[PDB]
Amino acid sequence: LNSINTNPGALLALQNLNSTNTELAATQGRINTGKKVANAKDNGAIWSMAKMQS
Amino acid sequence: LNSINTNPGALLALQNLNSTNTELAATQGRINTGKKVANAKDNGAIWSMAKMQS
Numbered sequence: 255l256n257s258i259n260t261n262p263g264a265l266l267a268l269q270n271l272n273s274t275n276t277e278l279a280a281t282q283g284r285i286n287t288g289k290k291v292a293n294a295k296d297n298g299a300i301w302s303m304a305k306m307q308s
Numbered sequence: 309l310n311s312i313n314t315n316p317g318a319l320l321a322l323q324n325l326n327s328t329n330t331e332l333a334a335t336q337g338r339i340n341t342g343k344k345v346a347n348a349k350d351n352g353a354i355w356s357m358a359k360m361q362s
Contacts, residue, residue: 257342258342259342259343
């Protein structure tokens with residue numbers, strides 16, 4: 255409301271900005287490595303099939 | 309009535325001014341702290357709830 259101690263709106267805006275930052279970091283990863291699933295964290299199943307294929 | 313030893317009306321005026329002074333002090337606390345339940349005396353149940361939540 256009119257609270258001075260805690261304002262929710264900065265918290266919501268920071269959550270949105272943090273989501274934007276994480277997805278931007280994911281695009282930075284996909285760009286710098288050229289691989290949509292560069293490691294097991296991206297997708298363990300597809301990464302395992304690709305590792306056996308390689 | 310016409311007594312000079314004591315005048316009740318001044319006592320009632322002092323009582324109303326004291327009530328105004330307590331309301332003003334409560335407003336000063338609500339302003340400088342920013343909390344309507346800053347301590348246990350404002351409301352013990354809401355204060356304990358907020359304390360456990362924090």
